[PDB]
Amino acid sequence: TLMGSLTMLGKAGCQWEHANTSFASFSNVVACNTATVTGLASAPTEGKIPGIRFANLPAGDYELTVLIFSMYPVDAGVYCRYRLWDGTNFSGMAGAYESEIYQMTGLFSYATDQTNLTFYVQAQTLTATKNCRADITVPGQDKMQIYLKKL
Amino acid sequence: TLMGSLTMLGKAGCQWEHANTSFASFSNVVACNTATVTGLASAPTEGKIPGIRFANLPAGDYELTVLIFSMYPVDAGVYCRYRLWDGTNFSGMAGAYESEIYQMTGLFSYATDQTNLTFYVQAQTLTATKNCRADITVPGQDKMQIYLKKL
Amino acid sequence: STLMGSLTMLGKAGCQWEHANTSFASFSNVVACNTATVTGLASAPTEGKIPGIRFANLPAGDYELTVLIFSMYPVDAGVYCRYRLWDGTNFSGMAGAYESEIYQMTGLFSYATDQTNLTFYVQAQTLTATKNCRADITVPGQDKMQIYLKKL
Numbered sequence: 001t002l003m004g005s006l007t008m009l010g011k012a013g014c015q016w017e018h019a020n021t022s023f024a025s026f027s028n029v030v031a032c033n034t035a036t037v038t039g040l041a042s043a044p045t046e047g048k049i050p051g052i053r054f055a056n057l058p059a060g061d062y063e064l065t066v067l068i069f070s071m072y073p074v075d076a077g078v079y080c081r082y083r084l085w086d087g088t089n090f091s092g093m094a095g096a097y098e099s100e101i102y103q104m105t106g107l108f109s110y111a112t113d114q115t116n117l118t119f120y121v122q123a124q125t126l127t128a129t130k131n132c133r134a135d136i137t138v139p140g141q142d143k144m145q146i147y148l149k150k151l
Numbered sequence: 152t153l154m155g156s157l158t159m160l161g162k163a164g165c166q167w168e169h170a171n172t173s174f175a176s177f178s179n180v181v182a183c184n185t186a187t188v189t190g191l192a193s194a195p196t197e198g199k200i201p202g203i204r205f206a207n208l209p210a211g212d213y214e215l216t217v218l219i220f221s222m223y224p225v226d227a228g229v230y231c232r233y234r235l236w237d238g239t240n241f242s243g244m245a246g247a248y249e250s251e252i253y254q255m256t257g258l259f260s261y262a263t264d265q266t267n268l269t270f271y272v273q274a275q276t277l278t279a280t281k282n283c284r285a286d287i288t289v290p291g292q293d294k295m296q297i298y299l300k301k302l
Numbered sequence: 303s304t305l306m307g308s309l310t311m312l313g314k315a316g317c318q319w320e321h322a323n324t325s326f327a328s329f330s331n332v333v334a335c336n337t338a339t340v341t342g343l344a345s346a347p348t349e350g351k352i353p354g355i356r357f358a359n360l361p362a363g364d365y366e367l368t369v370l371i372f373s374m375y376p377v378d379a380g381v382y383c384r385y386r387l388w389d390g391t392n393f394s395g396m397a398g399a400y401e402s403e404i405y406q407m408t409g410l411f412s413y414a415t416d417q418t419n420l421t422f423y424v425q426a427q428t429l430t431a432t433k434n435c436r437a438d439i440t441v442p443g444q445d446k447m448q449i450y451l452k453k454l
Contacts, residue, residue, distance in 0.1 A: 001304065002364045002454040005410065061153045061189075063216075063300075065366075067408060069396035081292075091296060093220035094253045102397040103408055105254060107156065107218060107296045109189075145394060145410050149366075149454060151153035151300060212305045214368075214452075242448060244372035245405040256370060256406055258308065258448050260341075302305035302452055 003062065003148040004041025006052045009033045010142030016050060017074060017133035018123065023083060023090075025120040026050055026134060041148065050121035050134050052146040057114040061151040064091070064106045064119050068144045071121070071134040072100040078125060080132035085122045096132075119148070154213065154299040155192025157203040160184050161293030167201060168225060168284040169274065174234060174241070176271040177201055177285060192299070201272035201285050203297040208265040211301050215242070215257040215270050218296040222252040222274075222285040229276060231283035236271045247283075270299070306365065306451040307344025309355040312336050313445030319353060320377060320436035321426070326386055326393070328423040329353055329437060344451070353424035353437050355449040360417040364454040366410055367394070367422050371447040373403040374437040376428070383435035384427045387411075389420060399435075422451070 008014070013031025018024055028047030035043055037052075044051040050068065064084055073080040073096055084092040084106035091106030104121065123132035136142035159165070164182030169175060179198030186194050188203075195202040201219065215235055224231040230248045234241040235257035242257030255272065274283035287293035311317070316334030321327060331350030338346045340355075347354040353371065367387055376383040379401055386396040387409035394409030407424065426435035439445035 005364075061156075065408065065410075067395050067410065070398060091294075092218055092254070093292070093294075095221065095251055099250070099400075099402065100398055103254075103395070103406075105216065105218065107216075107298055141396070143394075143396065147410055147454075151298075212303065212308075243370050243406070244444070244446075246373065246403055250402065254406075256368065258368075258370065258450055302303060302450075 001149050002039055003057065003150050004037065004039030004052070004054060005145065005147035006035045006037050006041050008035040008136060008144040010136040010138050010140070012137055012139065015133060015135050015137050017131040019125050019129050019131045021124060021128055023085065023122040023124045025085070025122050044118050050144060051118055052148065053118045054114065054148065055116060057110065057117050059110050059112050062108045063149045063151055064108060066104040066121060066146050068102065068134060068136065069142050070100040070102050072096050073125070074131040074133050078127045078130040080123055080125055082121060082123045085120045086117060152301045153190060154208065154301050155188065155190030155203070155205060156296065156298035157186045157188050157192050157194065159186040159199070159287065159295045161287035161290045163288055166284055166286040166288050168282040170276050170280050170282045172276055172279055174236070174273045174275045176236070176273050195269050201295060202269055203299065204269045205265065205299065206267060208261065208268050210261050210263050212260045214300045214302055215259060216298055217255040217272055219285060219287065220253055220293050223247050223250065224276070225282040225284050229278050229281040231277070232275045233283070234273050236273045237268060304453045305342055306360065306453055307340065307342030307355070307357060308448065308450035309344050309346065310339045311351070311439065311447045313439040313441050313443070315440050315442065318436055318438045318440050320434040322428050322432050322434045323426070324428060324431055326388065326425040326427045328388070328425050347421050353447065354421055355451065356421045357417065357451065358419060360413065360420050362413050362415050364410070364412045366408065366452045366454055369407040369424055369447070369449050371405065371437060371439065372445050373405055375399050375403040377434040377436050381433040382429040384429070386425050388423045388425045
């Protein structure tokens, strides 16, 4: 069932955020721990970000789960939408407003074998200049686990 | 294993609500898109609602997942309870108060093969006349994905 | 079957667990709670009627642990509580609450070798000393707790 997984332990400085009003992925942050991967999974070519890469994935139905402590809008009074994104399709949209997100789940289907397939956490802020954040800065506490189940 | 799935893409006017103080399913809204189904799944006989039907389902243990952006109480100051319901048992109860639900998960088991088995999202308001809502009115942003896994 | 086992506890007046540990801690036995119902490999935790599930044995592999519970929350306004799933060695599925509730937790756990006497716990931590974090299933016919482990 487990196609692959990716685990990133918290580390000072490992915080992703942007104020894009359109959905956008996060980008590499040098301070992050390298993620440990298993199975068919690898780090995204974009580097240390909330995401997971499958160089090869067979046709089929998949459930993607992101466990992250945690994601939230940085400022009060700001609404942030988050989604899981494979470059083409999205699933598992969620929102945060003076609140946090700790888990996202998405359903994805492929009729043909995939190559170089990356799943991303994306976010959009509903107030320009106000950031949406994914935060694993506290060692020993914060953690991200991403894993893909073949159904 | 993925027993079946049901996907409805968002569309203006496709929102469900009621103000029942007893748990109740939502009812057909004609503006909604026709859902697409895979595997053993079909649309509820009640029509375009948050739910999924299995004309036949083997004995077994099953995890039901509902991904939906989004469900919320229409008015501020109003508490809404939501549950997953198979006609006999409930699972995965959640609440909302000036807040949203994006996902629901339930565990259901059957000792014998089932026929005409429908799973429903149900809701109950804690203030009469004040509605609980499920809302997929924004095309390209909102979507409902319901799927059942055999454990 | 990938369902290694499950544990179910139906709501009952007085079945509420709470503490104010500033460090992550499990809950302890509450006498007013219903006894749990279990399936598969699972058993009730040796600590008693608590948010948790026990696996007297579990083969090496990868597992997803789900807790469905209506509900967990900080007792007081203005207090932040963290919850996490714990197997005595590692944690997963950390969640938080603040004038809000938790209804589901999910964790990913892996074992390179066969496990014996393995218990999974819901643990909590308050960020305001002396202010309780609670798991509440005191309403009969409405509240309940379902815990289950799936082999991946």
